[model samples]
Target chain A: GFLVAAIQFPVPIVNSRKDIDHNIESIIRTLHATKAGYPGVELIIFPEYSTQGLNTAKWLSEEFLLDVPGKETELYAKACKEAKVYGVFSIMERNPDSNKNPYNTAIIIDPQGEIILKYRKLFPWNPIEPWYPGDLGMPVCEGPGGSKLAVCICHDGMIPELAREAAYKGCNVYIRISGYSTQVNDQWILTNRSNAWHNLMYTVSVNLAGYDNVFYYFGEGQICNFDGTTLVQGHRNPWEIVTGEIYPKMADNARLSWGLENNIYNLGHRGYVAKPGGEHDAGLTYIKDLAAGKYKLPWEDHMKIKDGSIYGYPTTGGRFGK
Target chain B: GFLVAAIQFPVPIVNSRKDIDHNIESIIRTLHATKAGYPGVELIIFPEYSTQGLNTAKWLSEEFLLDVPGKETELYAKACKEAKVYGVFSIMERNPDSNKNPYNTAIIIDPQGEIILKYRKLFPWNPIEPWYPGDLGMPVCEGPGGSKLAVCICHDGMIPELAREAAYKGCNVYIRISGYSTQVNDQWILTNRSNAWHNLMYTVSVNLAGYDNVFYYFGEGQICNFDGTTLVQGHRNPWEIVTGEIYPKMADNARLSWGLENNIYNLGHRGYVAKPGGEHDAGLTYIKDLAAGKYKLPWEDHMKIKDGSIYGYPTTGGRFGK
Candidate 1:
């Protein structure tokens, strides 16, 4: 019965004047509008650097750099208070202690606008030019109806470890904020969408669509179901608002079923062995189907249905016309 | 350094007499034309069910089942012979012993136009319309330049184990021939591409772009590097002879480096934990970084040039740009 929303909304930067007030105003309006549109929606995701675009390094230092209960947050809190919906958004958290470093971060604000959870990007890019490293990589939060949340940054999705961390920590939904450039072909789409599909987690990804300097930001923002299916895909054009519902309960079945229907456990082999060459399962002597029912331990067996069917059945007798 | 080309040409139904002849002619003409255009191209790929789309039960029957050295095979053989290029293509294999279950398979035709190997899909679809099991899957083959080649049909890509099987079998390239339907969404693209990416092997996926019998096919074929980076992506429009190149030497290095990069033996805590957890090690995961000496390995040390510093310059730069 858990309901969530994966939203891809553009963060407006009006002529790069610095202060986030203008952009914040527009976003607060949008957030309120979205909550009204989607009645049952409890969480809304915003893109990376949601407050200010392009000149994040500058705006972060001068205009947007405030304490946890600062001005920009107060604005978001008011909006959340009115919408009665929790929200997930990204920002550039400047370290007051450090002059040169600022962390790329995502903050989840509860319905009262109070900060619930914050996750910082662990893996920065090859260039440490703009963003700074954060405290940790994996962070999970809880919401209404037993819903759980976890997060990673744009490039972090390419790494299986981050998602695995969230999965291990009991995260039901994984939200990713991206300041990704679409010019890199469909790598983001391929990675973001794929990570959600293969990892057995719900994924909501948002990307900056408009111009940051001269770079043409490409964002086909998406919401992917745990069963390797995308619920919706956004347009590539910059400055868009894409939205979709996320069902945490749907993931339990997806995770359970996809694990069986796919070659879930065995990823690939590494290192060379002197044993039997081709066809004898060389260097692959050890094996067992973890996804199978017989291997299920006492507690693990609780996840299964009474009929002993791991292949999840539709409660509605059909899903998406089956 | 190793490269492969995945071409997506529109393949319409050959059910109608005129359509059949036209498609075969179009395939041959495009092959000849593309081979001439990209003389350095080694492996060329095509979609599954190229000649005849597999739809109805009657189509897979013995009568409609074509032989290996049949007319269609001869046509491709002539093209390969003239072009002197290694090719991977798919066909509806009509097995006399099991004509009731004709296989969806791929033929690895050598440059000399000889059928060096044939890979039958291992897992066929379940819950048949007439109520029976599907009778086909794919197998691995060794083609020109000692290139270890493996071929799979559309659905096979969904199974990560299939790709691992090819990689485990010492395959240098894994080619997927997919007569993909429009039913595939963005998430499918992510998962399928991720399967190719994480496997750490060169994967070339060729899919049909046009419609057939009300089934609108998606995907404009694309080629992925050993580290799973997209090299070239095709269009979803009219048929075109797209091509790329692979260096035999680079493929060899990639095979060796991939072993050090993925360290799958020590992966997932050797099955000790409940969740198969691990980091993607992006530094080591990408073939580019391997070439760049990001993760220094004893075996790879030979490739590194030791200046005063421990780091070594990469032999190649990014494919997209500087």
Candidate 2:
């Protein structure tokens, strides 16, 4: 059992400073406060775009780009060391290791102030925000109470693949951090809850709160149980933290124990009763075709939104592109 | 736009002929009533084991076994022909072609009263249910307003594969029928709503209701929009129908038009900005290994609850079994 707190910080305009400085201080302050207020909290997380404010105009600009293990990340690590808890911090990371384009990245800092896990956002909120696509696979690491942890930033959690990959790798707790607001409230709830239940794990998610000059980032922090029931839901107020005690041992126990509705297990073992090793005939032909690199939607030629050009981004860029 | 109605019929102790007879009438009556009451309803659906009833003792006790396209199915066909709307009916069908064991089957009858779609429950509520595994794949048929339709029974819908297959096959309106009770209400909602959102399609689901001597089946009828929002939800009352004007064309429209978070397309085409055809590596290794017939959990050797013996059903039965 581990107590986890997801900080729904004041939408990055803390009055003392703005953008990177303000948010980094906010993150450090929250780490101190969470450790002090919520006793024995072993793990803590922040929303997507925590360092840089969600400035729509400058999001794609050079000002919003960040370094993963640079100065601010070191400060976050130091704060985690002081707080004596595992911390997951998100930012618009400048990927010098891969494509020059910045990526939505989340770095996990341990109690020793060491970066244990670093993940780039697999699926970026495209068109509006054209970050570098993640080349690194979804990586899972062990955390408090034998928890196998994996993190996906914002829109990555919206799709099931990231969560599925996490669960398939025996992850008991999945963290999703977002900077969404208004129209995506419903999307936020369903994805987080379903991701948890679908994998029979605890899903902890936090959203950035308050206005960022351009749009209101609703900090609807939430935690979902292995059963998809909303464990904790945060108010739509800035600086509101959603905290919950989640059992990683129990989640793994449920995954092994549940005879019915063990979805993650059932996905591969489609009909175990009938089949000795369960039926695995590659029924999802799309996935099969995808693996074979021959996947094409029936209406692909007719699909209107194929490229980001309509949303004002260059048609091609990044590691996989020419 | 297509109007679909889900019948939350009273649990199968209908005081009439009981078992298959009572529920057949209930389904036929509901079809007629829905056609008359909810005019222009293009399609209607029923819950799992509707004809068999949720009698725990007699579920696998020979009497629950049915024949697909037999007398009762013919009656349902005649009813669909008369009602002038498509209908989906569920039964514990006894398979004769390959496996002698019964299958949890859902058959879709068109306005022409023809059995257009027939799907056995791919993922049976195992341990308790010793049904034969589904041989034929998840089948989708075209409906009114150019809607693509597919049906999965009870526990089959609990897994994402069935729904994913349905949506991948171009199904915009996925129908999931269940006889699930109190404990699974949360599971029911999440799966139905998420399947819709995950695939960017409309998901209509219905559960059985009332006391069937052994268990009190709670009827919770629901229809979710392409955005995973609950369009309509019904009460626990039996005979209550969940009717909603689900836009199949609009669902397809969202799939085509949505630039970001278009989940169905995104699954195969991950990170489209970086990769032209999107990253198509088999990230889900379990799926890849399963395809290679070498899938195994790290703890499977130590993992308990692999067979039905713990739940009082024979493990050695069905097409896949020796």
DockQ of each: 0.05, 0.50
* Alpha carbon lDDT at B49, candidate 2: 71
Clashing pairs in 2: none
Predicted candidate 2 versus true structure: per-residue lDDT over A35-147, tens digit per residue: 89988899999887777776666665555666778888899999999888999988777668565467788888999999999898777666566666676778888899899
A-chain TM-score of every model: 0.72, 0.92
List residue ranges in candidate 1 displaced over 4 A.
A1-18, A56-71, A96-100, A144-146, A211-220, A235-240, A257-259, A262-322, B1-192, B195-201, B205-322
Off by over 4 Å in 2: A11-22, A56-64, A97-100, A211-217, A318-322, B11-19, B55-64, B97-100, B211-217, B318-322
lDDT, candidates in the order shown = 0.55, 0.77
DockQ, candidate 1, vs. native dimer: 0.05
Worst 10 residues of 1 chain A by lDDT: A269-278
